[PDB]
Amino acid sequence: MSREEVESLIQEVLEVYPEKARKDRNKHLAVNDPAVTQSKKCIISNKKSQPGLMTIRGCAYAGSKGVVWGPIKDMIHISHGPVGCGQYSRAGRRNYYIGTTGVNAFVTMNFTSDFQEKDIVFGGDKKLAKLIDEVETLFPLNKGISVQSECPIGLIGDDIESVSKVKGAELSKTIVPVRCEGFRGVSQSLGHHIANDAVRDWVLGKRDEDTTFASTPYDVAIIGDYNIGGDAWSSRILLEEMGLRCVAQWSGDGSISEIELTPKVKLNLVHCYRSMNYISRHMEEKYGIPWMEYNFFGPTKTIESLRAIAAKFDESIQKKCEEVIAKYKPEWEAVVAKYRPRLEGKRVMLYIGGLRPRHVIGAYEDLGMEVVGTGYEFAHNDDYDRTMKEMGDSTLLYDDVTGYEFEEFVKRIKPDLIGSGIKEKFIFQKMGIPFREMHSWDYSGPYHGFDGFAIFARDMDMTLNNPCWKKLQAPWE
Amino acid sequence: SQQVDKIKASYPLFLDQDYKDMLAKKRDGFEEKYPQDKIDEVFQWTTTKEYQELNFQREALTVNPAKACQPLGAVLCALGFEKTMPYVHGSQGCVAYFRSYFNRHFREPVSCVSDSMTEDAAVFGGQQNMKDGLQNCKATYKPDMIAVSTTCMAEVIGDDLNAFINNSKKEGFIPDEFPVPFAHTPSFVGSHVTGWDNMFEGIARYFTLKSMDDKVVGSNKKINIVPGFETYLGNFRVIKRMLSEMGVGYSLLSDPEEVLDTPADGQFRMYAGGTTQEEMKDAPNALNTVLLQPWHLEKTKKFVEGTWKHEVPKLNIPMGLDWTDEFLMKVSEISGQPIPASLTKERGRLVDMMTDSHTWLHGKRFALWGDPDFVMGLVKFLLELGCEPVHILCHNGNKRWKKAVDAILAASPYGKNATVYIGKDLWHLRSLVFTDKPDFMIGNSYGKFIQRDTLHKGKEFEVPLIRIGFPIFDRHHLHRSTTLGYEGAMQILTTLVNSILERLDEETRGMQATDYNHDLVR
Amino acid sequence: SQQVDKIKASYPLFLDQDYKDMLAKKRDGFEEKYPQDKIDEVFQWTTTKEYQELNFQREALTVNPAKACQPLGAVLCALGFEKTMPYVHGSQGCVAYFRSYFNRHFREPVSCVSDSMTEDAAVFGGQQNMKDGLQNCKATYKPDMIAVSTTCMAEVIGDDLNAFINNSKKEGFIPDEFPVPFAHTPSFVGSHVTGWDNMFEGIARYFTLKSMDDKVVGSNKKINIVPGFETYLGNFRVIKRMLSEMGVGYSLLSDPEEVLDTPADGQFRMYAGGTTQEEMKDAPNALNTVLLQPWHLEKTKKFVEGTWKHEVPKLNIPMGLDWTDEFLMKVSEISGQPIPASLTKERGRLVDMMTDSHTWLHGKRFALWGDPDFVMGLVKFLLELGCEPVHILCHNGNKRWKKAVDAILAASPYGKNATVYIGKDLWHLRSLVFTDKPDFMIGNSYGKFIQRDTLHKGKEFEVPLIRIGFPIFDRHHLHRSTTLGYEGAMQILTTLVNSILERLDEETRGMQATDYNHDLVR
Amino acid sequence: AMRQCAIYGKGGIGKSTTTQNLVAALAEMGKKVMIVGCDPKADSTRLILHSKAQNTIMEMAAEAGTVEDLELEDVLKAGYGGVKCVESGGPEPGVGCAGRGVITAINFLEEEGAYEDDLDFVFYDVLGDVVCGGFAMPIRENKAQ
Ligand code: CFM
Ligand code: CLF
Ligand code: SF4
Ligand SMILES: [Ca+2]
Ligand SMILES: [Ca+2]
């Protein structure tokens, strides 16, 4: 597909929209140019969504409770507000963890204040207090409590910060109030931030004067990995086999304690830049700790990262870094040998949140796959910068794409495989185009690391070359 | 590591020694986790009667609810109408979960939109998000009708759906005769089922309120059928089938049975079949209106009896031998069509089955939960089978209901040890199954955990979960099942007896130990 | 002991300490059993590759067959005819097992008689047992027709069914026009499916041989359908349903779908519906005759093509997406009726499902077994799903068949590790599942054991059995299932994927160990 | 209708040749025949197929697994006069009864019914040197009349 051709498409598509919308949308669609280094010159992002267009975006809450906090295993997260939000997100994100559920770990659990006609009327600041006591009594081993506020809290002046301070002090227990009310911001992003800040203000600096923790010149912390299907663990193992010592994981199978010792580290390894760069930049000021972003999607990008990381230490590390790559070379290569053929030349289209849309490209190319179009559901301009460099030439880029939009593009471009969310998975399948949840690994994974890729491949395969696809068209049609 | 020949995924990958020794360090090293022996202590504690008492005293805390908010049902309901696009006036994040939720349960595309209201509207409402919204939607997905619901926000800051809609028409954002029914659906009131009630009602009005003059009860010789919040396709169908087999003219109000099962032929349909608008407009002319799931259609029965002037019967959700009879009968009475040999037989067979395998079901303690009608129908049926529904929980139920159920329980020897609970959640149920242990749980996937827990305490304590309800995510295509009518009875009866036998096999498969009761013929 | 309040049956009664210490004495004291450690030795041995080799070399010994004798099929077949009484000319003991067998599978009353031949007839046949027999039967259960089959004895001493029957008419024991078709069915030849073939053929003749003059192919605009030996009610139905939905005129030859599901209304029916005699008599006038399960209807295809002069098509048992298409098509071609949107959709849906859950089914090794058509259709379908039917066993199959299957396997990437075996029994399969382990077995209840064994070796070795076939006794009402057509595909697809997921849950339910992959959404 | 004959006799005396020519002449007359080599030497078909040495069952079987692992397609060949011929296979030096390799070759042919086929004749070229139970096979199983 030519450049002058793609441009035309976008236009032919926007012809449906009404004036006002047709304009804002035109700004969120572009034809990649690997040359440009400033996104602002072709694609605008992180702006309010147009009403009625069926976006795939979400809200602060999700970006907060479901994205950052919910993952911590030892604390208890309270979905403060009506029952709604709390229920849908329950165990909806496969951010794995190790622990005895209900006793000292609570992730696949739903804690909510369940607001009622009266809690909205007279505020439920009261209930929230009582609640905590009941909490503290029935799940003693909890090492902390959070309060992810849903849409109604901020709208009725309730004041959680107080209750927290009070009850927290009163019980010698940590309690984090989070103003993640859905109406704030326009995506899951503002939630991240709001969340990050919260993390800092009420938890981060809790062990600054405390120096009993024995450190080492090889301590690090993985920031930005949510152990989706075990991603973290697959990444973790490499870093350690590399000799390093990761003190924490944010927030994949992470614990409050692991978070607290984060300042006692030498290097911050950030995966999801968009989700936690906020706490990193901070950690750099209030702790002088350096932070670099890596990527473990596909042998190539992985190897490249492993070294670029070892390069921040001594020989002992950089030697091991090679010992590792060595060990796994036979494996990842053997994989490419089996699947690379079965995929070579197949074009793919993606649309995810704020990192994967680009991070996974490498892995795909490593399998002769061609990403003809990717885009973000809520990424910021700085994300598209890092992006345009990975995406090929004359490719298609879309921000906060609309249901209609995404659907039409696919129809013209006719990708060989679409990787996106669940609110899509089923649409394109009826059109007969293989699909893979790039969000939840389609209940598979992990995809990060070496032992990961193996699967990533195997999967892309099974789904793309599955016979079922050759049967859509009826014989008598 | 990985053997390109036999790749291992998340599981059992992490069972590999290295991963084992990997996580072990991470634990001891930075997790500062409570000594196992404590975790084992605390756990054991929660499985006690003492913990229960403390648990049931909860007032402000709710752990693992068993209900969703109103909009979720308003959406579903709206989906039952030809080219109708569910529109939720409020924050966009909500619609996200809605589609996302249903998709996992139906494994089908759920079409629904939002006028993405934000912070900048928490002061001056969204009289604009509505204007632009309705226009954008109508011109993009070109629906024939747009039903409007609301989210938490929308109601708290209080927006007048009616007004806003009337202005979006006045100011010319959407034609003035373009159907745009509406209903307020506060999250903080009742459960999702309530949404449906409202929504439906909201549509009923929009097509029959301002025009009851030329309407005359019985003029069409049809019976209106309102399914309520139903998530099992097979139901909508069996209803239609039974009636059509009876020669009865019917008008199913709110039929999503088509858009929830669009076929995979190469093209995506965002709409499919469903209750036509004309069907709604005419409804008033129907001989009468039957409510399949009454216990959560009061706001509709009111309107129906009040406006349309229909004599809605006092019928229970048609589940199990008994009630379904009553349903067929009342239907006859109204329509004037005799119960066809066909059904007389289906019934007979349902009975055959019952006798064919009571021996196994007899005296089997169950703990169950779900929605009002569903739950009570399940209870009723278990009694018709000779089981003891010991823990009938129902988070979204009310007192009036609890009574009706107790009445049903009291009318059967098999209801002596039955207890009904409302307002309680799955964390409560968790205890009821430890202290006063049943043999199985009949409920949704959220119950998969309760099982895990019962096992952690021990094999002899594990309580197998029998998925029947909503939502269901850890199994596929069960949404094609059927619970209503005799067809339904049969399915459930089988899903049961077999679940039982299924487990008895597992308990007697032990070689030279218990495999002596591993009979071939059962 | 027993607590009148909570009575324990066989199990777990004998787990009580006293019963434990009770049996313990009995063992040590008088059983002279091999020291455990040996039993453990020998066992382990059988689970080896070495044992397999030795096992497959069996010639004279057969352990745990997977077929029944001919008469069993002649009976079933005969049951598909209006007021027809299956009559087995031979030792009475046989009929005992026959009814007794089917009852366990259908949980319905199987009506069948025997002219109780004894020792005193092993010399002068039973020309009398026939005379009195036919008379007694006819006057007692007053059937409209009596189909005669034979048992092992009858054939060995060799009796001429035809003659004996002709004399029973001549000597006046039963009217001369009373329908009494017959077929020889030697236990020692082929399996039970062969009986059906024979029997059916034997009836076909009795009503069309001596009168092919006024018959003219295509004169009735109908298609005859011969179901063969079918034990899943749901099938007979789906066929009728699909055709009737297609506007095709049909004549199902041998329809026991009614007497195998008589309703429980207070009165016992020994007969119910079934192929009328006139239907058979007229069959010749049918446009053509389709064989649902060809692989075991050769003796009928011959007669059909040979006498009736029909051009029987080369169709495979309609199972799975592909073949069922071909079936519908060929049916169209013949009838001249287009494939209705209805089915075009049912199909599309079947496909939706497939795409909806291939991920889970893909690359799943199965070991299966049963009858020719059934097995091959199962194989075909598993391939359309992306599974690897590794151990296709079929005791009653032949070489010609094995080839056709291998042809089917060779035409698919998913058939690389596939191996077909004929003549082998369940004890062979037992080894195949230990050495080259699959993920599930798809077969009848006889396989419940193989599972036990796979477990005795270890949890990681256990292979879950998925009941689909015949006979089935450890579960209830599965005989109401459906395997043919799209309806069928769906059922199986579900029974599968879910059996899979069902097990994955079990493997990740361990608290703080493997419960991390105990996802809610799958 | 199909006669089952077997030619027995000492080795190294043109037996195999006479036999084959016999079949050949038997072919001209119009009789459809089939030869089954039971001579450990394995050379009872060369003269009909022109081949230097046909593939014995025992060979191709050990290049497939057990027995019914292969198909008559590459075991049974049609040479002059449409004659069908298969060579059993020499017993494994030291281990294996020649007779054994025979039965397995017959029973195989029986299974894929290489017999039921208008055959008027079938000659089992059998070495009758040390007339043991092994070489007696075709007679014991009663396949040779
Ligand atoms: S859509 Fe990651 S910026 Fe966030 S839930 Fe997923 S594309 Fe998220 S990787 Fe993350 S683990 Fe995610 S996949 Fe950054 S945390 S808001 Mo939807
Ligand atoms: S933006 Fe919550 S679902 Fe909504 S109508 Fe809600 S209770 Fe019901 Fe939406 S998800 Fe919740 S209210 Fe939201 S914080 Fe974000
Ligand atoms: S029977 Fe003859 S050929 Fe066979 S093993 Fe004995 S001696 Fe050797
Ligand atoms: Ca679907
Ligand atoms: Ca019965």
Between C329, C516, C522, which is nearest A96 by CB? C516
Identify whether B32 is part of a domain: no
Identify whether B194 is part of a domain: yes
Annotated active-site residue D10? The verdict is yes
Residue B107 to residue C385: CA distance in whole angstroms: 18
Q: Do C141 and C85 meet the contact criterion of CB atoms below 8 Å apart?
A: yes
Q: Which of B497, B233, B291, B308 is nearest to B385 (CA)?
A: B497
Looking at the fold, whether C329 and C254 belong to one and the same domain comes out as no
> What is the DSSP secondary structure assignment for residue A406, as one 8-state letter?
H
Rg (C-alpha) for chain A, rounded Å, is 23
Annotated active-site residue D129? The verdict is yes
Q: Do B239 and B248 meet the contact criterion of CB atoms below 8 Å apart?
A: no
> What is the DSSP secondary structure assignment for residue A431, as one 8-state letter?
T
CB atoms within 10 A of CB A83: 28
Looking at the fold, whether C352 and C488 belong to one and the same domain comes out as yes
What token pair was written down for C518?
């105990």
Q: Do C463 and C433 meet the contact criterion of CB atoms below 8 Å apart?
A: yes
Phi, psi of D127 (to 5 degrees): -70, 120
CB atoms within 10 A of CB A326: 10
Q: Which residues contact B162 (CB under 8 A, 6 or more apart)?
A: B182
Looking at the fold, whether C379 and C454 belong to one and the same domain comes out as yes
Domain residue spans of chain A: 1-59+342-476, 60-202, 203-317
What token pair was written down for C55?
């096992």
Identify whether C423 is part of a domain: yes
Q: Which of A169, A234, A183, A157 is nearest to A64 (CA)?
A: A183
Looking at the fold, whether B273 and B336 belong to one and the same domain comes out as no
Looking at the fold, whether C331 and C378 belong to one and the same domain comes out as no
Grouping H, G, I as helix, E, B as strand and the rest as coil, residue B16 is: coil
DSSP-based helix, strand, coil % in chain D, nearest 5? 35, 20, 45
Q: Which atom of ligand 3 is least distant from the CA of D136?
A: 1
The single-letter code of the amino acid at B470 is: F
Q: Do C379 and C389 meet the contact criterion of CB atoms below 8 Å apart?
A: yes
Residue B438 to residue C38: CA distance in whole angstroms: 41
Scanning every residue of chain B, which has its alpha carbon at the shortest distance from the alpha carbon of C353? B477
Output the domain CATH number for residue C407: 3.40.50.1980
Residue C478 to residue C492: CA distance in whole angstroms: 12
Q: Which of B387, B404, B483 is nearest to B439 (CA)?
A: B387
CB atoms within 10 A of CB C20: 10
Residue A336 to residues A142, A358, C227: CA-CA distances in angstroms?
45, 21, 49
Residue B14 to residue B23: CA distance in whole angstroms: 9
Domain end position, chosen among C258, C290, C319 = C319
Phi, psi of B422 (to 5 degrees): -130, 155
The single-letter code of the amino acid at C382 is: L
Between B452, B478, B505, which is nearest C515 by CB? B452
Looking at the fold, whether C291 and C386 belong to one and the same domain comes out as no
Q: Do A31 and A6 meet the contact criterion of CB atoms below 8 Å apart?
A: yes
Between A89, A131, A182, which is nearest B60 by CB? A131
Do the chains B and D touch each other, judged by at least 3 C-beta pairs below 8 angstroms?
A: no
Number of H helices, E strands in chain C: 21, 11
Grouping H, G, I as helix, E, B as strand and the rest as coil, residue B117 is: strand
Identify whether C22 is part of a domain: no
Residue C97 to residue C114: CA distance in whole angstroms: 12
Annotated active-site residue D74? The verdict is no
Dihedral, CA of residue B317, residue B318, residue B324 and residue B326, to nearest 10: 30
Q: What's the gap in Å between D131 CA and the centre of ligand 3?
A: 9
Q: Which of B107, B98, B102 is nearest to B477 (CA)?
A: B107
Residue D54 to residues B52, D25, D83: CA-CA distances in angstroms?
83, 21, 14
CA angle A347–A352–A357, rounded 5-degree value: 55
Q: Which of B469, B444, B312 is nearest to B377 (CA)?
A: B469
Residue B486 to residue B340: CA distance in whole angstroms: 14
What token pair was written down for C349?
């849906």
Q: Which helix (H) or strand (E) holds C466?
A: strand C465-467
Classify domain A1-59+342-476 by CATH number.
3.40.50.1980
Looking at the fold, whether C327 and C297 belong to one and the same domain comes out as no
User: How is domain A60-202 classified at the architecture level of CATH?
Assistant: 3-Layer(aba) Sandwich (3.40)
Q: Which atom of ligand 3 is least distant from the CA of D99?
A: 4
Residue C110 to residue C95: CA distance in whole angstroms: 10
Q: Do B402 and B422 meet the contact criterion of CB atoms below 8 Å apart?
A: yes
Residue A60 to residue A65: CA distance in whole angstroms: 8
Residue B233 to residues A137, A169, B107, B109, C499: CA-CA distances in angstroms?
43, 52, 12, 15, 22
Q: With left for phi above 0 and alpha for psi between -120 and 50, is residue A452 left, alpha or beta?
A: alpha
For residue B326, what are the domain limits?
Answer: 320-363+484-522
Domain end position, chosen among C214, C232, C259 = C214
Looking at the fold, whether B507 and B402 belong to one and the same domain comes out as no
Residue B513 to residues A240, B505, B507, B517: CA-CA distances in angstroms?
46, 13, 10, 9
What token pair was written down for D91?
């017993």
What token pair was written down for B286?
């129907």
Q: What resolution in Å is listed for this PDB structure?
A: 3.2
CA angle D108–D110–D112, rounded 5-degree value: 70
Q: Which of A275, A283, A297, A223 is nearest to A254 (CA)?
A: A223
What token pair was written down for A4?
């002058």
The yes-or-no answer to whether A60-202 and A203-317 have a common fold is: yes
- Is the alpha carbon torsion for A274, A276, A279, A282 positive or negative? negative
Q: Do A296 and A305 meet the contact criterion of CB atoms below 8 Å apart?
A: yes
Of B156, B217, B226, B259, the catalytic one is B156
Experimental method: X-ray
What token pair was written down for C137?
């039967």
What's the domain count of chain C? 4
- Cβ of B341 under 8 Å from any chain A Cβ? no
From the candidates C337, C343, C362, C509, which should be mutated to test the interface with A, based on the most A CB atoms within 10 A? Answer: C362
Looking at the fold, whether B94 and B165 belong to one and the same domain comes out as yes
Looking at the fold, whether B412 and B458 belong to one and the same domain comes out as yes
Nearest CA to ligand 3 atom 5: D97
Scanning every residue of chain A, which has its alpha carbon at the shortest distance from the alpha carbon of C364? A462
Looking at the fold, whether C285 and C171 belong to one and the same domain comes out as no
Residue B202 to residue B148: CA distance in whole angstroms: 9
User: How is domain A203-317 classified at the architecture level of CATH?
Assistant: 3-Layer(aba) Sandwich (3.40)
Q: Which residues of C fall within a CB distance of 8 Å from D66?
A: 56
Of A25, A28, A30, A62, the catalytic one is A62
CB atoms within 10 A of CB B64: 24
CB atoms within 10 A of CB C165: 21
Residue listed under structure tokens 């059962």: B522
Looking at the fold, whether B183 and B111 belong to one and the same domain comes out as yes
Q: Which of B183, B232, B177, B207 is nearest to B75 (CA)?
A: B183
Residue C394 to residues B322, B423, C56, C375: CA-CA distances in angstroms?
45, 56, 15, 7
Chain D closest-CA separation from residue C188 CA (Å): 17
Identify whether C499 is part of a domain: yes
Q: Which residues of C fall within a CB distance of 8 Å from B521?
A: 104, 473-474
Domain end position, chosen among B214, B247, B262 = B214
